[PDB]
């Protein structure tokens, strides 16, 4: 539910604080949280909307020119002056031209020639500012238990279906309670202000295409720029470089415009996020939110249910997810009522001993008409095992086999941890964050190292970093002093920063 | 313009060959069309401006 097939989901087990677990939410995947005796909840960050942005400094990327004019002077007079130089709509350039005795004045030095041309911009891109307030996150969460496989990617009614909830989170209301009927409520305390750097990212539009763009990239742009409120007649601070003033072989001047610039900016944009826009609001689909889950008002609906014993029919097959788990969809035949579903990963045929873990909380069918559908999943052992569902004489047993021993599992866990650290920085230390002292010390030292590293490096992209990494690798390899480690150590970071993304 | 006949062969843009009788056939089909990928569920196609 929500995350069976996400393929970027991770399991946060238990709550050694008894009440809460800290969790970082990301757009790519989702988090399935399973407690000791509480229903498993799958949580996913869905969209981040930004609202009422303020236009700032719109640029012009396609210029157009108009009626040129010019003026010349004697080799010994003043300087040329067109009366269209007192108009802030004309680009004007002054140079020296060969004059004399053929051209119209008796003297032979260099004259002075001024040429002016009217500037007009058909379209310009504009950037808008994003305050870290007035931006909203929308979290979708769902619960395991009674849902049939159909209700995995179906978002039509979550108001009344008792098992799914939607939570809106803004700086003005950073905490919420997701009410799940019969399950109680999951408290959710989040940090919206600090999720993703939204104090340096302008929103950029060119023509119905929108990006997230850093500052200092939307200020070091050499293009004619207005300064905010376009009101009447447009004014451009610089018509410079959108207009090229060449001159012929010392006896003319020529004004041309450079063409439309809209492909240079597309290439200049790299490492800038894609965003879309609905009305006045902008939807970003790549983000980073940190939420602590107060999971102390969650109950188990199935407790005090007499276990159903009619029959169980597989409906689709037992399937294996990407992470090792196993999903099963069962149909119940003879209606008893609301009742507990028996299921386990068993081994010895006589002493059905629960081996492995079941990650579907406790299954219970809530409908009794004739036949019902439900979906559960479970984490079977690495060896052969049996999926056993039923009570007596009708326990349809399936033979399951898992591939990879614990060693590969730990390797993959380390890989995921490394990737999450590379993506998030110090915040990665908060993913499973019940909270001790080793965790806080690690987070603090990571904060200091990340600040230093981002100050020194972190002005480069995948090639300068690979080059400097290899160079420092050789350097530390052959320096023979006591700094060797430092050099090599720095590269690890650098190198993984290049090979993990 | 006048262009060196080595700057006009290392150009990464869709190129025809010779004059066009009708609608041209362009061989590259890339370096102007970008197939970006959503977060593991979609594909989107954009053109560079």
């Amino acid at each position, epitope marked *: 539910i929500r995350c069976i097939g996400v393929s970027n989901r991770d399991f946060v087990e238990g709550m050694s604080g008894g009440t809460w677990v800290d969790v970082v939410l990301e757009h790519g995947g989702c988090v399935t949280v399973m407690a000791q005796d509480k229903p498993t909840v799958d949580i996913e960050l869905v969209t981040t909307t930004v609202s009422n942005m303020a236009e700032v400094r719109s640029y012009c990327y396609e210029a157009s020119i108009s009626d040129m004019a010019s003026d010349s002077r004697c080799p010994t007079q003043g300087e040329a002056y067109l009366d269209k130089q007192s108009d802030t709509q004309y680009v004007c350039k002054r140079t020296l031209v060969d004059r004399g005795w053929g051209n119209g004045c008796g003297l032979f030095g260099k004259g002075s020639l001024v040429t002016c041309a009217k500037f007009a911009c058909s379209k310009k891109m504009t950037g808008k500012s994003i305050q870290p307030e007035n931006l909203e996150y929308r979290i979708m969460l769902s619960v395991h238990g009674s849902q049939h496989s*159909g209700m995995i990617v179906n978002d039509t009614g979550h108001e009344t279906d008792e098992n799914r909830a939607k939570v809106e989170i803004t700086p003005n209301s950073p905490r919420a309670e997701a009410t799940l009927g019969g399950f109680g409520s999951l408290g959710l305390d989040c940090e919206p202000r600090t999720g993703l750097d939204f104090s340096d990212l302008y929103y950029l539009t060119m023509n119905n295409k929108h990006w997230l763009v850093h500052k200092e990239w939307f200020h070091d742009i050499p293009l004619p720029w207005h300064a905010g409120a376009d009101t009447g007649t447009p004014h451009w601070n610089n018509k410079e470089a959108l207009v090229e003033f060449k001159d012929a072989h010392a006896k003319r001047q020529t004004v041309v415009v450079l063409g439309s610039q809209e492909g240079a900016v597309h290439t200049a944009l790299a490492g800038a996020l894609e965003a879309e826009m609905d009305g006045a609001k902008g939807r970003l689909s790549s983000g980073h939110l940190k939420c602590r889950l107060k999971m102390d008002k969650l109950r188990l609906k199935g407790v005090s249910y007499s276990l159903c014993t009619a029959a169980f029919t597989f409906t689709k097959i037992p399937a294996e997810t990407l992470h090792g788990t196993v999903t099963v969809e069962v149909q119940y035949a003879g209606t008893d009522g609301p009742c507990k579903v028996p299921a386990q990963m068993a081994v010895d045929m006589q002493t059905l001993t629960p081996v492995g873990r079941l990650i579907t909380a406790n299954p219970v069918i809530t409908e009794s008409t004739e036949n019902s559908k439900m979906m559960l999943e479970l984490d079977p052992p690495f060896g052969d095992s049996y999926i056993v569902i039923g009570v007596g004489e009708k326990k349809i047993t399936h033979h399951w086999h898992r591939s990879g021993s614990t060693i590969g599992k730990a390797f993959e866990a380390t890989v995921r941890g490394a990737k999450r650290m590379a993506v998030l920085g110090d915040t990665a230390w908060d993913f499973g964050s019940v909270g001790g002292a080793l965790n806080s010390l690690g987070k603090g030292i990571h904060q200091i190292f990340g600040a230093a590293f981002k100050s020194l490096f972190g002005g480069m992209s995948w090639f300068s970093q690979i080059l400097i990494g290899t160079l420092l690798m050789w350097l530390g390899l052959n320096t023979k002093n006591g700094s060797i480690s430092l050099m090599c150590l720095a590269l690890g970071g650098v190198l993984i920063f290049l090979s993990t993304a | 313009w006048l262009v060196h006949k080595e700057w006009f062969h290392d150009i990464p843009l869709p190129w025809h060959a010779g004059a066009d009788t009708g609608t041209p056939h362009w061989n590259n089909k890339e370096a102007l069309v970008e197939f970006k990928d959503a977060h593991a569920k979609r594909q989107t196609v954009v053109v560079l401006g």
Partner: antibody
Amino acid sequence: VQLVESGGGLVQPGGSLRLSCSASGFTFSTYSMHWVRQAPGKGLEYVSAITGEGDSAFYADSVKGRFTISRDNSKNTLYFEMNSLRPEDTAVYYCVGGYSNFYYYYTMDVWGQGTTVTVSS
Amino acid sequence: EIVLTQSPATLSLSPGERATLSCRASQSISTFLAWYQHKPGQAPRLLIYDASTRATGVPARFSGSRSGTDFTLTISTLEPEDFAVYYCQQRYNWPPYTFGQGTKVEIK
């Protein structure tokens, strides 16, 4: 939640026509739309489809090339611009819609009343 | 393309009799099959999706079952408003979707 269809009528062979389907009562953008036609005395034929966002479109071989499906999420309207009509296209056309999270897939649908399109002969 | 074949072309039954319709796919559809009820002068009405799941408001008498490639729609107690044409539709991976040729449930 309803779909009201319009634009059916009489047309000459080789002629053209545009059918419209106005959606109400739901977030149109979250619904994949489909066109299914039924000739007189014939079974239903699934002919065309478009994703919720308009990104991509699908056409059955029986219509691929002549018919164009489109949608405007601001006007909440689905369109089936069918040109080069043939007498074999004389049928009742019904636009259907289903909440979609993946390009065309849907589980529970909603149907309009249908509109008759008659090739002249 | 996948094809759906409904076995009975036309079925004649008295009111209250059991009604059975079978739809066979040319290839595996694991759990994706829908059943629709279509009355003349009316839009086709969705009855069952995912083979055995009843649509919203569909009475409990309509039941769906699957076995490999053979799907079955069962009507236990026929009521007069049930005599119409019934279609099966494949909801497998791609939009290429085929509606069966349909079966007519008639009042013999």
